[PDB]
Amino acid sequence: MSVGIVYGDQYRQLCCSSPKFGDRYALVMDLINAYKLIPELSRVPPLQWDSPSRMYEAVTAFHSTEYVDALKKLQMLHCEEKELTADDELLMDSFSLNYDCPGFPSVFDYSLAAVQGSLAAASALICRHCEVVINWGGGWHHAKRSEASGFCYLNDIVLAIHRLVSSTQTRVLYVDLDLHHGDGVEEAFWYSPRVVTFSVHHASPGFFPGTGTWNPIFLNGAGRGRFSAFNLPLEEGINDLDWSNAIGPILDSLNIVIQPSYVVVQCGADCLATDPHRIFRLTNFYPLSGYLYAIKKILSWKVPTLILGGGGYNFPDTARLWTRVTALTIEEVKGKKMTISPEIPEHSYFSRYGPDFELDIDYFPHSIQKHHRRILEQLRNYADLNKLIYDYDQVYQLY
Ligand SMILES: O=C(NO)c1ccc(Cn2c3c(c4cc(F)ccc42)S[C@@H](c2ccccc2)C3)s1
Ligand SMILES: [K+]
Ligand SMILES: [K+]
Ligand SMILES: [Zn+2]
């Protein structure tokens, strides 16, 4: 079927307006365009509303009205340059709109744009216009109902998933490949068995955000959502092959047992060896990149799939990975080989890919069993609670 991608003049401007991510979205979309992939991709325009009331209703489907009000006020205050009052500082602090989530003149428009993009992508999948939609302007998994966290202000992912499950028994599998635990998305659906969340991440004492590991039992959801939240915490230094072998059987087993109506994939690029975090050692190599291995396996299920961005602080290498992810998605969905030159094509941001100007990232690659057994038990428990019938032998053999 069609492969959708979210972009537009306003969307590009708004996604490039944040001080933290700067022009990362521009580099990603321009590298995709420079490799002549845009004519293969169906443009999905960001969702717009008919009234401020309809926008509020859509955003407050997850977030509190007072939090959205505070975020709007923060944008207004940063627009008309004037110091915050003591009461303003206190209000912003109550919503964690202070330290890691500072104000800036376009903070609300930037945050809302990601929601508009991911909601439009969800709709495009629901009406069966595209089989896969990509939104490199989205993937902000940390935002909570009444709290900004990790430069995530509004949770585009939660609102997209909510729209998918609200459509016409619908089940959504969320896969979070970001370096960081997808705490916001996990928490939002903590009580739902219809939305299964799976985050693979680094966890270590004091490492953001501190969740998605032991606390000495593994929390995995509550009430009807019990056993429905999956986490694979991994130690520092893991490469393409070990990461692939760690998550491969989990993805296969989750797809087989859940039989999802939709798959939502957060594809945060901060696991790359060349990310300034310097924690994981993943690449964008395609002859194999763990990212490309995971995406190819997910797409092989032939389930309507939403692919989002997220983390990734090496902007050129994030662009190199996500261009490869967009080419692979076209190949797997349309069955059309997308030949990509090892040399970065001439375009606006060509100099940003120096000094080698190659598509492959400059890197030479060189405990899980216990997690696999635990996750196999959790998946059995999930199936037993929700009365899902599956071949226990088939799932066992995958690991
Ligand atoms: O990727 C994430 N979620 O998936 C993140 C959540 C919170 C994060 C932490 N984090 C980081 C920065 C930052 C800036 C912010 F305004 C808010 C959160 C921030 S500078 C970045 C860095 C790392 C190593 C070397 C130099 C710079 C780390 S990143
Ligand atoms: K993750
Ligand atoms: K859940
Ligand atoms: Zn991250």
Coordinates of N, CA and C in Angstrom, one line a residue, residues 197-298:
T197 N 2.5 -1.9 25.7 CA 3.7 -1.1 25.6 C 4.9 -1.9 25.8
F198 N 5.9 -1.8 25.0 CA 7.2 -2.5 25.1 C 8.3 -1.4 24.8
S199 N 9.1 -1.1 25.9 CA 10.3 -0.2 25.8 C 11.6 -1.1 26.0
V200 N 12.5 -0.9 25.1 CA 13.9 -1.4 25.2 C 14.7 -0.1 25.4
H201 N 15.6 -0.1 26.4 CA 16.3 1.1 26.9 C 17.5 0.8 27.7
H202 N 18.4 1.8 27.9 CA 19.4 1.8 29.0 C 18.7 2.2 30.3
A203 N 19.1 1.5 31.4 CA 18.7 1.8 32.8 C 20.0 1.7 33.6
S204 N 20.3 2.6 34.5 CA 21.4 2.6 35.5 C 21.1 3.6 36.5
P205 N 21.6 3.4 37.8 CA 21.3 4.4 38.9 C 21.6 5.8 38.4
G206 N 20.6 6.7 38.5 CA 20.6 8.1 38.3 C 20.4 8.5 36.8
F207 N 20.2 7.5 35.9 CA 20.0 7.7 34.5 C 18.5 8.0 34.2
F208 N 18.3 9.0 33.5 CA 16.9 9.5 33.1 C 16.2 8.5 32.4
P209 N 14.9 8.3 32.6 CA 14.1 8.9 33.7 C 14.1 8.1 35.0
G210 N 14.8 6.9 35.1 CA 14.9 6.1 36.3 C 14.0 4.9 36.3
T211 N 13.0 4.8 35.4 CA 12.0 3.8 35.4 C 12.3 2.7 34.3
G212 N 11.5 1.7 34.2 CA 11.6 0.7 33.2 C 12.6 -0.4 33.6
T213 N 12.7 -0.6 34.9 CA 13.7 -1.6 35.5 C 13.1 -2.2 36.8
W214 N 13.9 -2.8 37.6 CA 13.5 -3.3 39.0 C 13.3 -2.1 39.9
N215 N 12.4 -2.2 40.8 CA 12.1 -1.1 41.8 C 11.8 -1.7 43.2
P216 N 12.3 -6.1 45.0 CA 13.0 -6.1 43.7 C 12.1 -6.8 42.7
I217 N 11.0 -6.3 42.4 CA 10.0 -6.8 41.4 C 9.9 -5.9 40.2
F218 N 9.5 -6.4 39.0 CA 9.2 -5.7 37.8 C 7.7 -5.3 37.8
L219 N 7.4 -4.0 37.9 CA 6.0 -3.5 37.6 C 5.7 -3.6 36.1
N220 N 4.5 -4.1 35.8 CA 4.2 -4.4 34.4 C 2.7 -4.1 34.0
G221 N 2.1 -3.1 34.8 CA 0.7 -2.7 34.6 C -0.1 -3.1 35.9
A222 N -1.3 -2.5 36.0 CA -2.2 -2.7 37.1 C -3.7 -2.9 36.6
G223 N -4.6 -3.4 37.4 CA -6.0 -3.7 37.1 C -6.1 -4.6 35.9
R224 N -6.9 -4.2 34.9 CA -7.1 -4.9 33.6 C -5.8 -4.8 32.7
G225 N -4.9 -3.9 33.0 CA -3.7 -3.7 32.2 C -2.5 -4.5 32.8
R226 N -2.8 -5.4 33.8 CA -1.7 -6.2 34.5 C -1.0 -7.0 33.4
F227 N 0.3 -7.1 33.5 CA 1.2 -7.9 32.6 C 1.3 -7.3 31.2
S228 N 0.8 -6.1 31.0 CA 0.6 -5.4 29.6 C 1.7 -4.4 29.4
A229 N 2.6 -4.1 30.3 CA 3.8 -3.2 30.1 C 5.1 -4.0 30.2
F230 N 5.8 -4.1 29.1 CA 7.0 -4.8 28.9 C 8.2 -3.9 28.9
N231 N 9.3 -4.2 29.5 CA 10.6 -3.4 29.6 C 11.8 -4.3 29.5
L232 N 12.7 -3.9 28.6 CA 14.1 -4.6 28.5 C 15.1 -3.5 28.8
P233 N 15.6 -3.4 30.1 CA 16.7 -2.6 30.5 C 18.0 -3.3 30.0
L234 N 18.9 -2.6 29.3 CA 20.2 -3.1 28.9 C 21.3 -2.2 29.4
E235 N 22.4 -2.9 29.7 CA 23.7 -2.2 30.2 C 24.3 -1.4 29.0
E236 N 25.2 -0.5 29.3 CA 26.0 0.4 28.4 C 26.8 -0.5 27.4
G237 N 26.9 -0.1 26.2 CA 27.9 -0.6 25.2 C 27.4 -1.6 24.2
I238 N 26.1 -1.9 24.3 CA 25.5 -3.0 23.4 C 25.5 -2.6 21.9
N239 N 25.9 -3.5 21.1 CA 26.1 -3.3 19.6 C 24.8 -3.8 18.8
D240 N 24.9 -3.6 17.5 CA 23.7 -4.0 16.6 C 23.2 -5.4 16.8
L241 N 24.2 -6.4 16.8 CA 23.8 -7.8 16.8 C 23.1 -8.2 18.1
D242 N 23.8 -7.9 19.2 CA 23.3 -8.2 20.6 C 21.9 -7.6 20.9
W243 N 21.8 -6.3 20.5 CA 20.5 -5.5 20.6 C 19.4 -6.2 19.8
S244 N 19.7 -6.6 18.6 CA 18.8 -7.3 17.6 C 18.4 -8.6 18.2
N245 N 19.3 -9.4 18.7 CA 19.0 -10.7 19.3 C 18.2 -10.6 20.6
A246 N 18.5 -9.5 21.4 CA 17.7 -9.2 22.6 C 16.3 -8.9 22.3
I247 N 16.0 -8.1 21.3 CA 14.6 -7.6 21.1 C 13.8 -8.4 20.0
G248 N 14.5 -9.1 19.1 CA 13.9 -9.8 18.0 C 12.8 -10.8 18.5
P249 N 13.2 -11.8 19.3 CA 12.2 -12.8 19.9 C 11.1 -12.1 20.7
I250 N 11.3 -11.0 21.3 CA 10.3 -10.3 22.1 C 9.2 -9.7 21.1
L251 N 9.7 -9.0 20.1 CA 8.8 -8.4 19.1 C 8.0 -9.5 18.4
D252 N 8.6 -10.6 18.0 CA 8.0 -11.7 17.3 C 6.9 -12.3 18.2
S253 N 7.2 -12.5 19.5 CA 6.3 -13.2 20.5 C 5.1 -12.2 20.8
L254 N 5.4 -10.9 20.9 CA 4.3 -9.9 21.2 C 3.3 -9.8 20.0
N255 N 3.8 -9.7 18.8 CA 3.0 -9.7 17.5 C 2.1 -11.0 17.5
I256 N 2.7 -12.2 17.7 CA 2.0 -13.5 17.6 C 0.9 -13.6 18.7
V257 N 1.2 -13.2 19.9 CA 0.2 -13.3 21.1 C -0.8 -12.2 21.0
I258 N -0.4 -10.9 20.8 CA -1.4 -9.8 20.8 C -2.2 -9.7 19.5
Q259 N -1.6 -10.0 18.4 CA -2.2 -9.9 17.0 C -2.7 -8.4 16.9
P260 N -1.8 -7.4 17.0 CA -2.3 -6.0 17.1 C -3.0 -5.6 15.8
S261 N -4.0 -4.7 15.9 CA -4.6 -4.0 14.8 C -3.7 -2.9 14.2
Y262 N -2.9 -2.3 15.1 CA -2.0 -1.2 14.8 C -0.7 -1.4 15.6
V263 N 0.5 -1.0 15.0 CA 1.8 -0.9 15.7 C 2.3 0.5 15.6
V264 N 2.6 1.1 16.8 CA 3.2 2.4 16.9 C 4.7 2.3 17.4
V265 N 5.6 2.7 16.6 CA 7.1 2.5 16.8 C 7.7 3.9 17.1
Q266 N 8.2 4.2 18.3 CA 9.1 5.3 18.6 C 10.5 4.9 18.2
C267 N 11.2 5.6 17.3 CA 12.5 5.2 16.7 C 13.6 6.3 17.0
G268 N 13.6 6.7 18.3 CA 14.6 7.6 18.8 C 16.0 7.2 18.5
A269 N 16.9 8.0 17.9 CA 18.2 7.7 17.3 C 19.3 7.9 18.3
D270 N 19.0 8.0 19.6 CA 20.1 8.3 20.7 C 20.7 6.9 21.1
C271 N 20.4 5.8 20.5 CA 21.2 4.5 20.7 C 22.4 4.5 19.8
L272 N 22.5 5.4 18.8 CA 23.6 5.4 17.8 C 24.9 5.5 18.6
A273 N 26.0 4.9 18.1 CA 27.3 4.9 18.7 C 27.8 6.3 18.8
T274 N 27.4 7.2 17.8 CA 27.9 8.6 17.6 C 27.0 9.6 18.2
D275 N 26.0 9.1 18.9 CA 25.1 10.0 19.8 C 26.0 10.5 20.9
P276 N 25.9 11.8 21.3 CA 26.7 12.4 22.4 C 26.5 11.7 23.8
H277 N 25.4 11.0 24.0 CA 25.1 10.2 25.2 C 26.2 9.1 25.3
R278 N 26.6 8.5 24.2 CA 27.8 7.5 24.1 C 27.5 6.3 25.0
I279 N 26.2 5.8 25.0 CA 25.8 4.7 25.9 C 25.7 3.4 25.1
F280 N 24.9 3.3 24.0 CA 24.7 2.2 23.1 C 25.6 2.4 21.9
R281 N 25.8 1.4 21.1 CA 26.8 1.3 19.9 C 26.1 0.9 18.7
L282 N 24.8 1.2 18.5 CA 24.0 0.9 17.3 C 24.5 1.8 16.1
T283 N 24.2 1.3 14.9 CA 24.6 2.0 13.6 C 23.4 2.2 12.7
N284 N 23.6 2.6 11.5 CA 22.6 2.7 10.4 C 23.0 1.9 9.2
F285 N 23.9 0.9 9.4 CA 24.5 0.1 8.4 C 23.4 -0.8 7.7
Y286 N 23.4 -0.8 6.4 CA 22.5 -1.7 5.6 C 23.4 -2.4 4.5
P287 N 23.6 -3.7 4.5 CA 24.5 -4.4 3.6 C 23.8 -4.4 2.1
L288 N 24.3 -5.4 10.2 CA 23.0 -4.8 10.0 C 22.6 -4.0 11.2
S289 N 22.3 -2.7 11.0 CA 21.7 -1.8 12.0 C 20.6 -2.5 12.8
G290 N 20.7 -2.4 14.1 CA 19.6 -2.9 15.0 C 18.3 -2.2 14.7
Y291 N 18.3 -0.9 14.5 CA 17.2 -0.1 14.1 C 16.5 -0.7 12.9
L292 N 17.3 -0.9 11.8 CA 16.7 -1.4 10.5 C 16.2 -2.8 10.7
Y293 N 16.9 -3.7 11.5 CA 16.5 -5.0 11.8 C 15.1 -5.0 12.4
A294 N 15.0 -4.2 13.5 CA 13.7 -4.1 14.2 C 12.6 -3.6 13.3
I295 N 12.8 -2.6 12.5 CA 11.8 -1.9 11.6 C 11.4 -3.0 10.6
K296 N 12.4 -3.6 9.9 CA 12.1 -4.7 8.9 C 11.2 -5.8 9.5
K297 N 11.5 -6.2 10.7 CA 10.8 -7.3 11.4 C 9.3 -6.8 11.6
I298 N 9.2 -5.6 12.1 CA 7.8 -5.0 12.5 C 7.0 -4.9 11.2

